[PDB]
Every structure is written in C-alpha cells, then in structure tokens.
C-alpha cells in the first residue's frame, strides 16, 4: 500500500558501474506481493545522453531488531572492498531489470514475490565515463505498482544529484587505502591532488605509507596515473613499514609555479601511532622529520626530499608536522604551510610556517591556540592570515588572526561559534574578487557539517571575511558516512574543486559552480 | 649486554614459505652495533633433509610506549591478509641471510647497523611440501655475535616444534575467511573437514556463507580441492547474503560410511546476527532452518539439502541449530548430533539430537543445562553419552551424562572444574581400547586452555572416562592468538588429528601420536 523513497545526496561517480539513485522501503508487504513496475522521471533539462544504464535491484528484507525507518540492510556499493568498489556487491543486490537507452520517463519491472514485512529495492544509475562533472540529474519515482495497483509513494526524493569522480578507490595499484587529501591549481590551470598511499591497511603513521599525487590537465574529467611524490622505502635498512611518510600538505608558489609538498617521515617506532610515540630530539631515530619535495614542471616530476626539521623544530617538541591539505602564496609572495606541534607536556598547538625566499628557508614563531591540531590558512585581506583550527574541545572550529606571520595572534569573532565540527580536518581558502565570476572576495570552507561523526560534507561560502556563513551560501555533497577530510581549490573563475574522503571513494573529486554557492 | 630468544610453540606449516622458528629481542643496542653471526643447533635425530631453507630477517625497532618485553613489533606472517598468508610481509621484515642446506649447526649473518635500544630479528623455517606431519624440530640459538663478541643469551627456547598444514588460508578461492571446523575419519580412513566459507568478511550468519569441505586420502599430507557441501545461493530470489548456511557439524554413520552434515540456513534477517535476530516460528521466513546433506561416496559428492526443522524444532524457540564440529555413531548404531536452542525468553540450552533409523528421522528430548550453547558428545561407556558444553557463566566447561538420549541428565564429577575455558567451542571424542595403540579407553579434548582470550590450543587425554585430565597427558599446539574453534578425529590406531582455527591459518590440520599424549 505505502512505499518510501530516498534520493540520497551522495556523489554519482562517472567512473562507477553502480551508483545509488533511489533507495526504496516497502515496510508492510504480504508474502507474495510483487512490485510489477515502477516509473522514474528525469527533469526536462537533464542530459540523458550521458546516462549509460538504469538498474532495479532487490536486496531482500531487514533483521527483526533493526527497526522500520532504514532504507537498506547493508551498504550496496562498497568504498572499502579492495576486490570491488565500482559495482553493487552481487551477494547483497539481485538485478530485476535494466534499461540502457534512457528517456525522460523510464519503467523498471520485477516478478519477485516479496516476504512479509520490510522489502528493500533500489535504483542504480551508471553514467558514461566522459559525463560532464558539472552535469546534474533531477530524478523522481513517479509511480510504483504492487499487485497491478498504484501504491502511495512517500519520502523526501527532490534532491538535485551531482557527479564526481573516484580518483582513488580502495585497492587501486595494490594499495589497501588512500587518506589525507590536498589540492592545488597550478598557474597552468592543472589540478594536483596529494594523499597518503596506505599499502597494508588504513592506520596512521607509523606504517608503510608513501605520498601519492594525481594530476589533471582537463579540470578533473581525467586523472593521469598516480605518481609517488615522496617515499623512504628501506632507508638505513629499516623495513618500509618503519619508514612511512604522510599527512601531506601541497602549495603552489604562485610567483614561479614551483609546487611544494611537505609531509611527516617516521623512522622506526615499531608498528604504533606516531601521534603518541614520536619523542623529543631532532634525529630521524628520535622524532618525526619534516620533509619537502618540489616540482618545477607543473607536477610531472618531483625533487629528492630535503629535511627541514633542523630549521624549524624545537628540540623539546615530541612531534612537529604540517597541517594536512594545502598551503598558500600571500599577495607579497610569502609561502605559508599550516603546522602543528606537540610540546614537551604532550599538548598539541596549531600555527604557521612561512618562507620569504621561494622556499629556501622556513620559520615558525608562536602557536595560535592550545589543544588544537590540524589547521588551514587563508589570506582573508592583505597581510592578514586567518588560521582555522581543529579544536580538541569539540563542537566548533577555532579561528585566529595574525598580521605578523604568527609572532602574535588575535581571536576572530567567528572563533568557537560560526563553524560546527566533530574534531576533523577542514579546508579553508580565499578567492580574490578579480579571480572569480562573483567579483567579490570569498572565503570557501569545507568539512563534515556536524558535531558528531563524519558526514554531510558541505562547501560553505562567506562574503564578509568569515564573520558570517549564511546557510543559503552552502552546498551539501555527501550526507553519508566517510573519513571526512577535504581540500578546496578554485579550478577557474566560475568553479571550485573539492578533493575529499567521501562515502563513495577514498579520494573523490567534485566541481561546483560558484553561482550554486552564491545565488 | 643480554639477548633474548623465543621459540614460539606454533605450528610450522609444510605449505608455508615462512614460519617463525625464533623471535629475537636485542633490548640495549648502541647505534651501529651489528649482529655479525647467530648459530642455531638442531637435535641429532631431526630430519633436517625435510628443511628446505632457514632465513634471518630484521624487523627494525619498537615504539617508545610499547615497553621492552615483546619479541616483535607486529605479526611477521599474516593468517588474515587475503593477498599473502604464506610469506613474511616484506614491508615488516628484510631478509639478511638464507641457508638452503641445513646441518645440525647453522650460522646466519647480517651487516645491518642497529638503532639505539630495542632491535628485532627473527628466524624463518621453510619445510619441503612433502614434510611428514609427524616430524619434529628441536632447535636452540646456541651463539649470537654482536661486534665480534659472543653475547649472553636468555629466554625459554626449549620447545619441541611440530608441523601442520594450512588446509584453508584467508582469501583462498575468493573467500575472505573460513571458520567453524568439523572433522571425521570415514570407514575408508578418509579425513573430511567442514567449515563456513565466509565470502565477504568473517562475521557470523546472517551473511554470504556456504559450507565447504576438504577431503584427504593420505592422513592430511594432501587435501583435494574445496567442495561446497551446502549452499542456498539466491533461494526465493533473496540475495545470497540473505541465504547464508553455516556452523556445520559432520558425523560418519559408522555402520554404512554414509557421511552427514547438518548446518543452520538463515533466509532474510537483513545483514544482522542470527543469534539475536532468529525469531520464533517454523518457516524459512520466520526462523533459522536445520538443514542436512549426506555423501554415500566417502565425501566426494553431496545430496541436495533436506529440511529437518519440522521434525525437531519447538515453534516457541527463537533459534535451533547443531553444535558446531562433529557428531557420532554410538555402539548400537544411533547417530547423535549435539544441538543448541534459544528458548522464548532468549535463554540458550545445549542438548542432543539422535536418529535410530540411519538418519531418516531425528528427535530431541530435554536440554542438559541452562545458559549453555556449543557442545560436543562422546559415548564414554556403552549407552552413556557425555555432553561437554560451552557455559555462559565463564571459567570452565559444563559436563553432563544422559543414558536415555537426553530424556534425563546428570552432572558429571568434572562439571565446571576439570576443564578451563574462555567461553569457546571445544572438541571431545572417545576412543575404544581395541581401536588405539595404548589398548585403553581414551577421552581426548581440545580447546584454548585459558579462561581469557583464545590461545594455548591444547589436546588433553583422560584414561578415567573424563573424571581426570592429568597435566602430563596434554600437548600444547598453538600458544598464540586465534579464533579458537577445534575438532578432533582419530586418523588411525596411533595418531589423533585436529582441524582448528590457529594463529597460522584459518583451517589448520595437525597429527599427534597418542604416545605423545600418554607417556
């Protein structure tokens, strides 16, 4: 009688075989009831030529103790299974029907006799691999026929679906997982995304981890095969599992187009976490090392690593490392990487590291705030750096200002108020008025828009230097659960790129029109 | 300084590339110290011609916070990694040396400069694939040279090492894992081992699970490819992930050599655990089904499944299923499978199910004991069944006696005292005096010999019908951590076979001389 439809706000991957378009719960079936046919409609302006196929799956029933409001018994398309992240797990979903030439109206059929109570069906959409990342589907379930009677359809299903691309899936190139995204746009308009390649599993340093890089010359439609930007293999005859390097941060020197990548190299430390096992000192045997590579050829090839630990780490610190994601060039040509150190009392502090000499020497002054870790920095107005910080107190981002490259710090009005978080990495960037179609200075921010867990990956825009984040100036990309880290970079004058850990792939790229953020 | 050696009592797998012979901790190294040469000695009577190669690996150091008492920073040879369960993970261990012609004395060399403090080395043995499962190595590290000085060696390293075979490793035949061993010996001397084939992961029903079978005609030296004894695929058009069958129990009808396998089929139940989601009723849609297959050709081929549920399940029970492992033939030709049911109040009880008509009809009378689950049964004396039970109260096995096939039950003297457990499946069998080289009635029992965790897999023998389990009448097979389930079967007059979840493989077979149990 009554059917419930979900249109989940998750990215449709152009490189996937299956993407969840609709989840369907029939909660009160009589044994033998048959879903004869359901009709989908697409909006008049949708580019149906990019839709390769639409499939109807059956996924059986629910466990007696799991309640009646769920839209699935299990995840239908895995982002973690190293043997298949691209199609529906065939042991959870059985194909009922498939249409491979898609009109504005579309009928799918079954002859599946239902069980008493809850029955789960879902609709998969496969896109052509060359689908525009900027294309959108507006899709509705308009009719559901059970025992040759139309049924009453309920549910929020009006979502406007966006595309993305799975730049890295679990298992790709033999690597168990990929984590910790960074993204820049080079002066040539080339997108460069960095991440940990976590070969054995998904646990943080210490482990067998290298810094990977994906390059795109076509605004993320295609990604050139993975390069290893940084690696320490069997340095000093210690196992590769005791020579991990990761939590990368990337910046483009906008004066020279030299691209810089900083990461933490851990040498030894058994098979335990660096965050609690990195100790005071300076040598590789004693403490995590701050390591840098550069590219003078728009991110095609990477220098040997240089060790900048001695320049910038206080000996008493347990751990100095970059803030994962990206750094910046300021208007005056200063290169700035956010950093974080654990002091002698095991207390984490966020701050900034800068170079005034094109990355020859690096300096750190004063920490911004106690019990902060991962931070990103934007030049919100000339000579004024905004540091946006993960805060161990929970609930919301810490926001501070320096005008003296972190010799002194001021609380911003938005501090511990304007931006909710669950204690997770977040991305912040500034966009000059002349560099975007709105013709106004922007801050853009991305994180899991929640105080618990990691979900509702959202891009937010500010017109007033991060004093205010109006709800109207926000786009939700991923309402399902993921590892939550993200990084923003403007692609061109009209579109922002987000490189993030999503519900649909370890490294997900999406492109969003600025005019979708600020209407 | 002092060097520490461990000789871990874990099976040496004849089908493995790497097996841990020795773990070595050097706790107080100066940076640059070199382990020049280490000498191992083998007992005069060892069959060193079946040793193919011995390797020395370096595994780097320990994390600051993990203390000084460990013999490794990580597991060297994985029993879980679907991409490699057979050789050392090369990212954790670097080969220093290798000897391929093994004498009574053997020297291994390195030129690896050590780091300050804890350094880990270990010795791998590779066996010839045709190595006798009965063969044994008595191996000691007799000299360790650091900076051309002999070092003081400490550690318990006098273990007599035993062989085994990995009948199923994680990943084999595309299956994520294998669990829940059963083992019988047919009238033809054929070994038959059953287990769950858990395709997606290692979680219990409900999931994509089939019953697998491995067959050996040569006392476990070789195993015929895996057969699927029982499967429900896409029954009623429900996904295979909602048609799992598992926790198998196998018995041989000793009168006919007909082999029987009973298992629990779960139909629906979303992706949740049957133990809490199986509900009262009788139909496949309502409750777990008791399902049986047979083999009339010594385990080569398997009948279609028969549904036994209506014969034996009380409608008010939430869940009826076999006790995993094996059943028996009694001296009078009765076939007995241990069973377990959850009553309407969610309270588990162990008991027995029997057939007096060669498996045509099955009967259950009274439960043995409240808050018991997994049990195994042996005919300790003519017409006298001993039920050995997993007990939710913790600490020790429940042991009861019926002489009326479970219409009535008596506490055995050994009840909740003689046999420690951590609440884990255990195996119990009886061996007649005329059927074994000792010429005395035996009970043999196997489980994790501990009240916490799952380790120290041990075979125990009783000469007094399970009244006493003397410490001397025990063999330790696996002191490291595993999933803990085991099943015993006499191979011939002189040797017991054990098919178990071990630290070294999901399904491990070992053979043990009875005269090693009773000296």
């Amino acid at each position: 009688d009554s059917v419930y439809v979900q249109n989940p706000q998750i990215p449709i991957l152009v490189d996937r075989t299956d993407n969840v378009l609709f989840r369907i719960r029939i909660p009160d079936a009589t044994k033998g009831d048959v879903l004869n046919r359901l009709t989908i409609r697409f909006g008049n302006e949708d580019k149906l030529s990019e839709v390769k196929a639409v499939r109807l799956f059956y996924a059986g029933t629910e466990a007696a103790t799991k309640g009646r409001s769920r839209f699935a018994p299990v995840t239908y398309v895995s982002s973690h299974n190293i043997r298949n992240t691209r199609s529906a797990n065939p042991s959870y979903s059985i194909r009922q029907d498939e249409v491979t030439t898609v009109a504005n109206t579309l009928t799918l059929k079954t002859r599946q006799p239902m069980v008493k109570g809850i029955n789960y069906f879902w609709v998969s959409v496969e896109m052509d691999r060359n689908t525009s990342l900027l294309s959108k589907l507006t899709s509705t379930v308009t009719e559901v026929v059970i025992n040759d009677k139309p049924a009453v359809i309920a549910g929020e299903q009006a979502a406007v679906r966006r595309m993305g691309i799975g730049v890295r899936h679990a298992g790709d190139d033999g690597s168990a997982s990929f984590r910790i995204p960074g993204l820049v746009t080079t002066n040539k308009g080339t997108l460069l995304g960095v991440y940990d390649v976590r070969y054995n599993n998904s646990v943080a340093l210490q482990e067998h981890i290298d810094v990977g890089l994906s390059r795109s010359t076509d605004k993320g439609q295609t990604w050139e095969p993975m390069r290893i930007a940084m690696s320490f293999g069997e340095t000093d005859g210690l196992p590769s599992g005791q020579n991990g390097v990761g939590d990368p941060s990337i910046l483009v020197d906008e004066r020279t187009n030299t691209v810089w990548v900083v990461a933490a190299w851990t040498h030894g430390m058994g098979n335990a976490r660096a965050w609690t096992n990195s100790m005071p000192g300076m040598t590789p045997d004693e403490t995590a090392q701050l390591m840098m590579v550069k590219s003078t050829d728009d991110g095609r090839t990477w220098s040997e690593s240089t060790n900048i630990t001695s320049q910038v780490k206080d000996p008493s610190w347990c751990f100095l490392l970059q803030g994962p994601g990206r750094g910046i060039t300021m208007r005056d040509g200063t290169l700035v990487f956010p950093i974080q150190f654990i002091d002698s009392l095991r207390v984490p502090h966020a701050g900034i590291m800068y170079s005034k000499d094109r990355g020859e020497t690096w300096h750190i002054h004063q920490p911004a705030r106690t019990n902060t870790t991962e931070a990103q920095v934007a030049e919100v107005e000339p000579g004024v750096l905004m540091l946006n910080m993960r805060d161990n107190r929970g609930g919301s981002r810490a926001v501070s200002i320096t005008r003296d490259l972190g010799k002194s710090w001021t609380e911003h009005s938005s501090n511990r108020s304007a931006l909710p978080e669950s204690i997770c990495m977040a991305s912040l960037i500034s966009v000059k008025a002349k560099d975007n179609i709105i013709g106004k200075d922007l801050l853009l921010f991305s994180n899991p828009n929640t105080t618990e867990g990691r979900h509702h990956i959202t891009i937010k825009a500010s017109l007033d230097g991060g004093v205010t984040w109006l709800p109207a100036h926000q786009v939700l990309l991923d309402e399902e659960d993921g590892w939550g880290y993200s990084c923003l970079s403007m692609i061109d004058r009209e579109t922002v790129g987000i490189f993030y850990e999503s519900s649909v792939a370890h490294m997900t790229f999406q492109a969003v029109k600025i005019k979708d953020l600020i209407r």
Side-chain angles (χ1 to χ4, degrees), chain A residues 1-155 157-519:
Chain A
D1 196 54
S2 201
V3 171
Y4 288 80
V5 174
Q6 174 205 69
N7 190 340
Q9 191 49 246
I10 65 181
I12 303 176
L13 291 195
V14 298
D15 64 308
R16 252 182 172 178
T17 301
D18 290 302
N19 309 272
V20 180
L21 181 61
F22 291 119
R23 295 194 183 86
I24 297 166
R25 185 186 64 262
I26 314 188
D28 305 305
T30 304
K31 176 167 186 66
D33 294 357
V34 177
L35 175 35
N36 307 118
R37 73 192 153 284
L38 71 69
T39 307
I40 280 96
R41 200 157 189 291
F42 294 97
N44 289 320
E45 288 184 341
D46 297 8
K47 202 172 152 66
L48 299 181
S49 67
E50 306 179 301
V51 185
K52 182 176 185 198
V54 175
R55 284 184 268 285
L56 178 62
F57 288 97
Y58 181 59
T61 194
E62 195 45 83
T65 68
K66 296 286 278 282
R68 313 185 46 79
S69 71
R70 308 174 66 209
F71 274 105
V74 65
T75 121
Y76 290 145
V77 192
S78 174
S79 66
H80 294 300
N81 172 17
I82 70 161
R83 297 321 205 186
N84 176 19
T85 55
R86 285 178 181 80
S87 64
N89 183 325
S91 69
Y92 300 145
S93 306
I94 298 169
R95 195 186 68 217
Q96 308 292 291
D97 206 0
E98 166 179 281
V99 169
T100 55
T101 170
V102 177
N104 272 111
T105 296
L106 190 144
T107 290
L108 295 158
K109 291 165 156 56
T110 94
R111 57 171 67 78
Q112 177 51 38
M114 282 182 257
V115 300
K116 186 186 156 190
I118 299 158
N119 291 256
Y120 292 119
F121 299 85
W122 66 280
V123 179
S124 177
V125 72
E126 191 175 352
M127 305 305 293
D128 191 278
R129 302 294 173 261
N130 297 141
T131 295
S132 173
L133 285 175
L134 296 186
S135 277
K136 299 196 258 195
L137 294 177
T138 303
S139 195
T140 274
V141 176
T142 55
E143 181 175 50
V144 180
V145 176
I146 297 160
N147 312 332
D148 303 310
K149 279 170 294 191
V152 165
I153 303 169
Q157 60 158 321
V160 178
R161 293 297 291 282
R162 284 169 189 284
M163 307 297 143
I165 183 165
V167 174
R168 302 277 73 193
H169 303 239
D172 281 348
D173 296 337
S175 189
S177 71
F178 303 94
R179 287 215 60 199
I180 321 308
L183 183 74
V184 295
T185 310
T186 78
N187 295 351
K188 304 282 82 152
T190 308
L191 294 169
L192 297 176
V194 288
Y195 40 83
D196 289 10
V197 185
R198 295 191 184 182
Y199 292 106
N200 286 316
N201 54 51
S202 69
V203 312
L205 299 160
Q206 173 68 284
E207 251 293 351
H208 185 203
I209 305 179
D210 295 331
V211 179
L213 177 128
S214 308
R215 180 162 186 278
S216 177
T217 52
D218 64 10
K219 310 198 181 185
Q221 289 303 148
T222 336
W223 293 85
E224 291 173 354
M226 179 173 71
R227 296 166 168 88
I228 290 163
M230 214 167 134
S231 199
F232 290 91
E234 291 175 342
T235 306
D236 297 312
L238 275 214
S240 71
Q242 294 194 9
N243 268 312
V245 54
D247 283 3
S249 197
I250 184 158
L251 70 77
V252 55
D253 178 355
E254 296 188 359
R255 295 307 186 89
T256 67
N257 205 40
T258 301
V259 185
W260 293 87
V261 167
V262 62
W265 170 40
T266 53
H267 183 68
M269 298 191 190
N271 187 239
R273 305 292 70 70
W275 188 255
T276 54
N277 287 282
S278 189
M279 290 299 159
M282 296 299 283
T283 74
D285 276 346
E286 289 165 337
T287 198
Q289 304 288 291
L290 196 61
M291 299 296 162
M292 287 189 73
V293 294
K294 65 180 185 202
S295 185
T296 60
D297 61 351
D298 199 61
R300 290 194 201 76
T301 196
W302 294 90
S303 74
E304 287 170 73
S305 60
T306 59
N307 187 334
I308 75 152
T309 309
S310 67
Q311 290 190 50
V312 177
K313 182 185 180 292
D314 184 300
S316 77
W317 298 344
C318 293
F319 205 167
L320 171 58
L321 70 156
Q322 65 290 329
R326 72 173 299 166
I328 65 165
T329 304
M330 298 181 64
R331 291 165 175 281
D332 70 358
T334 309
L335 310 184
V336 194
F337 274 122
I339 58 90
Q340 45 174 333
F341 66 88
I342 306 182
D343 67 16
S344 60
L345 283 163
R346 274 279 156 196
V347 179
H349 310 269
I352 63 170
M353 183 174 63
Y354 68 98
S355 178
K356 290 181 174 191
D357 54 356
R358 310 268 112 258
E360 285 311 285
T361 55
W362 299 87
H363 305 270
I364 292 169
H365 296 308
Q366 284 317 110
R369 182 180 164 91
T370 73
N371 237 318
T372 56
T373 52
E374 299 169 340
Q376 294 287 260
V377 68
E379 195 183 17
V380 54
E381 72 201 48
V384 347
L385 296 179
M386 176 173 279
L387 192 65
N388 182 300
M389 291 166 275
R390 175 163 167 165
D391 191 325
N392 284 324
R393 299 166 187 73
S396 63
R397 303 293 290 184
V399 184
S400 298
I401 302 293
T402 179
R403 302 178 162 75
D404 56 15
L405 296 159
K407 289 174 154 186
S408 76
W409 290 95
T410 273
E411 192 192 20
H412 199 247
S413 63
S414 71
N415 186 52
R416 294 292 292 167
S417 190
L419 291 170
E421 72 149 352
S422 62
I423 309 168
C424 187
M425 184 267 180
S427 172
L428 175 68
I429 62 160
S430 55
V431 193
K432 301 186 178 82
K434 57 156 212 214
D435 286 343
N436 77 83
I437 187 158
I438 293 296
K440 300 179 176 200
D441 292 332
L442 304 186
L443 296 196
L444 301 182
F445 169 93
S446 68
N447 91 320
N449 188 19
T450 174
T451 58
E452 63 77 26
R454 291 171 187 194
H455 55 85
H456 290 82
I457 312 297
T458 298
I459 308 177
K460 305 181 164 173
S462 171
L463 296 177
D464 66 354
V467 173
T468 316
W469 299 97
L470 305 176
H473 300 142
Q474 305 190 342
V475 298
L476 171 59
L477 299 183
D478 186 10
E479 67 180 318
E480 294 180 21
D481 292 331
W483 284 331
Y485 287 39
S486 67
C487 201
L488 298 170
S489 188
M490 292 298 291
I491 298 162
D492 54 36
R493 301 184 61 269
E494 308 191 353
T495 55
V496 67
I498 186 182
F499 194 51
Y500 73 105
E501 315 173 318
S502 81
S503 58
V504 300
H506 284 196
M507 295 290 142
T508 307
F509 184 84
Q510 290 191 280
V512 173
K513 285 161 164 175
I514 289 309
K515 303 305 293 278
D516 285 358
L517 282 173
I518 305 155
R519 307 148 73 203

